[PDB]
Design a protein around this nucleic acid. Structure first.
Lengths: 98, 129, 132, 83, 217, 71, 221, 25
RNA sequence: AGAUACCGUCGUAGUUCCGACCAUAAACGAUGCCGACCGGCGAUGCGGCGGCGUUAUUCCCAUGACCCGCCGGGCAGCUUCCGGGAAACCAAAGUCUUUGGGUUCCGGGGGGAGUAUGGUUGCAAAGCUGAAACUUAAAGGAAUUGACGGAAGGGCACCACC
């Protein structure tokens, strides 16, 4: 039976979209199909930002971030708990969880 | 493309009856539609219409009552003999009390009742009950 | 460990519905009230019921309760039925009017009233939250 | 209804929607005969007579019942022709 | 209600609609509420036509006067703003109030203690009081509904276009209606301006109760 | 049917004729491969010479020897 | 057996004040009291159990065998009710379905095949009724035909008082509940069908709630 | 058997049938 | 255990380009095309039309960038007792026993079988066309309830842990 109206992707009037390699695997997944995360992240978490500002050459040097876009296959995204099985109603909720 | 102007009109008034609209617009007018509509009106399944006259295939605004159960076409136009008309009205009309097969005879477009009196069959147009 | 069961709470909310007037904050009276106004086969259950009666009596004297109805709420149904304030906020002489709220009144017989105040309309036709 | 004798033989004649002319079924439970009270022309008070409209449930769940009382009222000059 | 100067929109009546702001509709518009609007403002607020507001409240009042036994016109409001206005209207008109928490099956289920079986509903908001509209379907109940431009007209049989969001505009549209149903019965006279005050029907914010206490100390 | 036109008798008939072969009860009867394989050759009954007596095992649910004859 | 009526509509029936259930059917009033039909059509009303259909829900340790009883009811002149009740014991299902049938009873319209002499015998038009895949179609038939139908929808049309009827069923009619309902939805849509006889504009007579508003205040709380 | 591998068995067996029928012509 | 597998290190044809062949995919929206009609809403892409005001070329005019609509086609989305459907779901899968707008292709229980055979296309691989004997009482669809999971969560317990 049909589980998702979009067939679990986001091509509508295309026919073909270029496959990307998964970051965890290297499974060739269509760009629209892939679970995508744009994680903006500090080069140090919380345990080192205290230690580096103290031992800086520069006063008022904001510690720069690390910009990585993560592409996932569905088997990597669910196994690493990025996405998650939802109830048949809750599936349709396209609002990203805050 | 549009290959039965009568069929695309009878359905248009039928969808409006199913919905409960008080009057319906039917974009292409033919003498065949007007003659079909006038036959429904003399039996009183529609209120008075008016053909809007452009320098083209005119339009019609039919004032709908809520008397019309279904208005349906027969395509193609099966030629009907009087000995075969009873078999048509067996399996096209609900009861032998009400409902009318109109069919285009030589004596003009008219219901099967008027087409019986004149003892003259012809090509079936559609029906309404 | 001490949660009242429905048997205690139903007996409580019906005793305070009916015999409200006899009851009050004091436990030891409305312990002994239950001996006259019910047939309870247990001493332990009598105290449970009478205990949650006093807990509801401190609630009822403070405000309305979800699962109760008495004649003092019927009296305060009548009290707040007669809150007559100082003259209302509708009997004003300056009621602010948009040019377009004037246009629809101009079409009516109420063209210009002496006690209206027409303003200039808000420039920047800008009334939607952006998407995301 | 009639036979050859002419006598009405069926056991009840159903009502018929005042908006769309469609007869109201024996179990159309969303049907509503509503009395619009008649006001005295010069007093502005209730006469004792009513302007009765029956609307079938297929209109109410379509969202067209309060447009069609508004038309049935203005057809009977309850609502102003100006409106 | 039409061509009758006795049921004319009185000169006092407009300035109450303008003060309370019952003309002042929603941001977006329902397709069946398009007939109750003059114009859309620059700064997208839909101006409700107060003439066509008045013509419906008169039609709604006729619906309630036409009910002989006044008890069984069950009056309903779930939101903050109407709970007071309905309990006033029920005593004022002689109707039955349901102010806050309409239990599902109070019209359908026989064995419920609150098996009310009315002849007419009056509703503060379709989108808020959506529940009694779906039992107004199951038992042969005509609906009256105080409606707004962004509100849907599903199952509602006579609808008054209002600002049923606004604080005072709810109570005012109840006050206007409580009066008119009495005027037509012949309790109130159309000569004398009515004793009962429109402020009586307004929802009192418990924040303003603790502030009015120290202002009137 | 699909093609309704007043002058469409040869397609409706030839379609019905072509698609009748996809019926099992038809193609079995109207190709003589069934009749060529039928040991009776279309006969209701037939006579034959008994040449041994076979004890046929029944199907799994019903375990018993069905005493048949090779004719 | 006293029966103190719960509903407003029920009270009028017990006081012999609303005197025909055609006055109930006219105003589309839901009949929630069972002992209204036991009053009007009471002893004229025949019970035949169509079927006992044992249903099962798989639980942790075995199946819970509930019994679905289908009762068709009706006096052999104007009224039928198809009631179904799923109980745990078989006797309760029958008693439950008899009650649920009576609540569900409809008036069947009956007309004439062609010539219009005597008392009516057949369906007034070509009604259809379908639930599930089962499409049931009833057709008017001449006097003395009997019901040309399957034994079960025949069993309802006999109860309805339709003496003559051609039928043409379609779909999985071996599943009875669908076939019993589908035929019931056909003889529910007889009075719902707008024939030119029913073109005379409605003269809206007074509702029994409005007629007896003087009595529905004082005979109870 | 996967319908694809069922199909691949036929295309190896059809391939050997053609082989034998070339040897006899 | 085996591991001619998954994992790892290498690596042939291939992957790239030019020119010919092949004609198949879950080539899927598993949904033929043309036309008519039947609810709502907010978006979006494109063109056009009109309408306060901000901004740029500032020095205006006309133009871009926003903003508020309207219209036409377009990919879509949500919404509902239009209606349909076995249901899942579908404004199309609706307008269907109240059965006919036009037309094309194609199905007839499951296997045997896309097999054998013949024809045909191709260098080959194979493509197109395509049986029968025989076998079999089911195969299958949707949904429900349980049970199970080397799925995800939320509990409880000194017959669990700390």
């Amino acid at each position: 039976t049909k589980k998702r109206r979009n067939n679990g992707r986001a091509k509508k009037g295309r026919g073909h979209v270029q496959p990307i390699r998964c970051t965890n695997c290297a499974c060739c997944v269509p760009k629209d199909k892939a679970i995508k995360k744009f994680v903006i992240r500090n080069i140090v978490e919380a345990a080192a930002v205290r230690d580096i500002s103290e031992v800086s050459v520069f006063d008022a040097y904001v510690l720069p971030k690390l910009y990585v876009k993560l592409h996932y296959c569905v088997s990597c995204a669910i196994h690493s708990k990025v996405v998650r099985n939802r109830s048949r109603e809750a599936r349709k909720d396209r609002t990203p969880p805050p | 493309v549009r290959m039965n102007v009568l069929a695309d009109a009878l359905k248009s008034i039928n969808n409006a009856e199913k919905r409960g609209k008080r009057q319906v617009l039917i974009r292409p007018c033919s003498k065949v539609i007007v003659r079909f509509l006038t036959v429904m009106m003399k039996h009183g399944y529609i209120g008075e219409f008016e053909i809007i006259d452009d320098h083209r295939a005119g339009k019609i605004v039919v004032n709908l009552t809520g008397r019309l159960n279904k208005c349906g076409v027969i395509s193609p136009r099966f030629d009907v003999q009087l000995k075969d008309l009873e078999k048509w009205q067996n399996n096209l009309l609900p009861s032998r009390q009400f409902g009318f097969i109109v069919l285009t005879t030589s004596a003009g477009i008219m219901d099967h009742e008027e087409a019986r009196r004149k003892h003259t069959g012809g090509k079936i147009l559609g029906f309404f009950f | 460990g001490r949660v009242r069961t429905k048997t205690v709470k139903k007996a409580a909310r019906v005793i305070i519905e009916k015999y409200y007037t006899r009851l009050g904050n004091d436990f030891h009276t409305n312990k002994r009230v239950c001996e006259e106004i019910a047939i309870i086969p247990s001493k332990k259950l009598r105290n449970k019921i009478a205990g949650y009666v006093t807990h509801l009596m401190k609630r009822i004297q403070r405000g309305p309760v979800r699962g109760i109805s008495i004649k003092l709420q019927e009296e305060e149904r009548e009290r707040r039925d007669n809150y007559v304030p100082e003259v209302s906020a509708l009997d004003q002489e300056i009621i602010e009017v948009d040019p377009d709220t004037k246009e629809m009144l101009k079409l009516l017989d109420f063209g210009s009233l002496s006690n209206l105040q027409v303003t200039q309309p808000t420039v920047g036709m800008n009334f939607k939250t952006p998407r995301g | 209804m009639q036979s050859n004798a002419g006598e009405f033989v069926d056991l009840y004649v159903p009502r018929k929607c005042s908006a769309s002319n469609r007869i109201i079924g024996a179990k159309d439970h969303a049907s509503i005969p509503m009395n619009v009270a008649e006001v005295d022309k010069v007093t502005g008070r209730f006469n004792g007579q009513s302007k009765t409209y029956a609307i079938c449930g297929a209109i109410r769940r379509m969202g067209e019942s309060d447009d069609s009382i508004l038309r049935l009222a203005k057809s009977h000059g309850i609502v102003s022709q100006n409106f | 209600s039409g061509a009758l100067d006795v049921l004319q929109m009185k000169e006092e009546d407009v300035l109450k609609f303008l003060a309370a702001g019952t003309h002042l509709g929603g941001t977006n518009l329902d397709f069946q509420m398009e007939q109750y609007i003059y114009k859309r403002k620059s700064d997208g607020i839909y101006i409700i036509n107060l003439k066509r507001t008045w013509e419906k409240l008169l039609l709604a009042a006729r619906a309630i006067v036409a009910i002989e036994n006044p008890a069984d016109v069950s009056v309903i409001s779930s939101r903050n703003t109407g709970q007071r206005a309905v309990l006033k209207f029920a005593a004022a008109t002689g109707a039955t109030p349901i102010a806050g928490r309409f239990t599902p099956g109070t019209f359908t289920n026989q064995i419920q203690a609150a098996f009310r079986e009315p002849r007419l509903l009056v509703v503060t908001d379709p989108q808020a009081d959506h529940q009694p509209l779906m039992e107004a379907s199951y038992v042969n109940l005509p609906t009256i509904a105080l409606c707004n431009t962004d509100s849907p007209l599903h199952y509602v049989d006579i609808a008054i276009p209002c600002n049923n969001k606004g604080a005072h505009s709810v109570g005012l549209m109840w006050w206007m209606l409580a009066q008119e149903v009495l005027r037509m019965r012949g309790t109130i006279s159309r000569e004398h301006p009515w004793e009962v005050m429109p402020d009586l029907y307004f929802y009192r914010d418990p924040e303003e109760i603790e502030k009015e206490e120290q202002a009137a100390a | 049917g699909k093609c309704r036109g007043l002058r469409t008798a040869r397609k409706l008939r030839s379609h019905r004729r072509d698609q009748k072969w996809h019926d099992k009860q038809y193609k079995k009867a109207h190709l003589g491969t069934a009749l060529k394989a039928n040991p009776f050759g279309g006969a209701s009954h037939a006579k034959g010479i008994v040449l041994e007596k076979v004890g046929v095992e029944a199907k799994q649910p019903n375990s018993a020897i069905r005493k048949c004859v090779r004719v | 057996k006293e029966w103190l009526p719960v509903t407003k509509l029920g009270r009028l029936v017990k006081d012999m004040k609303i005197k025909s259930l055609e006055e109930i059917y006219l105003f589309s009033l839901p009949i929630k009291e069972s002992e209204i039909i036991d009053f009007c059509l009471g002893a004229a009303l025949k019970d035949e159990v169509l079927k006992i259909m044992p249903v099962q829900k798989q639980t942790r340790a075995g199946q819970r065998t509930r019994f679905k009883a289908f009762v068709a009811i009706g006096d052999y002149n104007g009224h039928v009710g198809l009631g179904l009740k799923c109980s745990k014991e078989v006797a309760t299902a029958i008693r439950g379905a008899i009650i649920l049938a009576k609540l569900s009873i409809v008036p069947v319209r009956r007309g004439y095949w062609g010539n219009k002499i005597g008392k009516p015998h057949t369906v007034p038009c070509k009604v259809t009724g379908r639930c599930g895949s089962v499409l049931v179609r009833l057709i008017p038939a001449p006097r003395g035909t009997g019901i040309v139908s399957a034994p079960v929808p025949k069993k309802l049309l006999l109860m309805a008082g339709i003496d003559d009827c051609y039928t043409s069923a379609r779909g999985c009619t071996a599943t009875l509940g669908n076939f019993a309902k589908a035929t019931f939805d056909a003889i529910s849509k007889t009075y719902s069908y707008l024939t030119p006889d029913l073109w005379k504009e409605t003269v809206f007579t007074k509702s029994p709630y409005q007629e007896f508003t003087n009595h529905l205040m004082k005979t109870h709380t | 058997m996967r319908a694809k591998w069922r199909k691949k068995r036929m295309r190896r067996l059809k391939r050997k049938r053609r082989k034998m029928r070339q040897r006899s012509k």
